């Protein structure tokens, strides 16, 4: 009952029981975020 994500075949991916029970084996979702720096070229308005 602590491990339905490993034992139970009827486990839907992403199901918790958090108001009742801590499930010790679940479907996380790893991330690979990229962090863009901004090194653009900056311009000035002409006198015209």
């Amino acid at each position: 009952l602590r491990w339905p994500g490993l034992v139970d075949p009827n486990y839907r991916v992403g199901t918790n029981d958090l108001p009742n029970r801590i499930t010790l084996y679940n479907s996380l979702y790893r991330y690979n975020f990229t962090y863009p720096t901004l090194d653009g070229i900056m311009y000035v308005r002409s006198a015209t």
């Binding site: 311009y43 002409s46 015209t48």
Partner: protein, 97 residues
């Protein structure tokens, strides 16, 4: 002109010739006057936007629209005073070609 001051605009086109060459007295008609057929006027910043993956860099015109470099362009004097590093690196080699 008698006091070392020339009037009129300035043309920068590649003219590889062999015969007579008179810059001060252009014997031909002056090409691409401002507002002519598909002649484009650069906006106030003189701003090249870069484009990825082999696409040509676009130039922002007076109507704030990035239009492509190859063609006839009018630059105001004051735009070219501040875009001169962008001029020399992006659209001046396109003149030499």
């Amino acid at each position: 002109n008698l006091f070392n001051v020339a009037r009129g605009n300035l043309y920068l086109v590649q003219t590889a010739t062999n015969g007579n060459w008179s810059p001060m007295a252009p014997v031909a008609a002056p090409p691409f006057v401002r507002g002519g057929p598909n002649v484009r006027v650069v906006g106030r910043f003189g701003t090249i936007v870069p484009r990825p993956n082999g696409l040509e860099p676009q130039l922002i015109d007076d109507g704030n629209v990035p239009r492509d470099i190859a063609g006839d362009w009018v630059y105001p004097s004051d735009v070219l005073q501040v875009s001169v590093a962008v001029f020399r690196d992006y659209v001046w080699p396109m003149v030499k070609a």
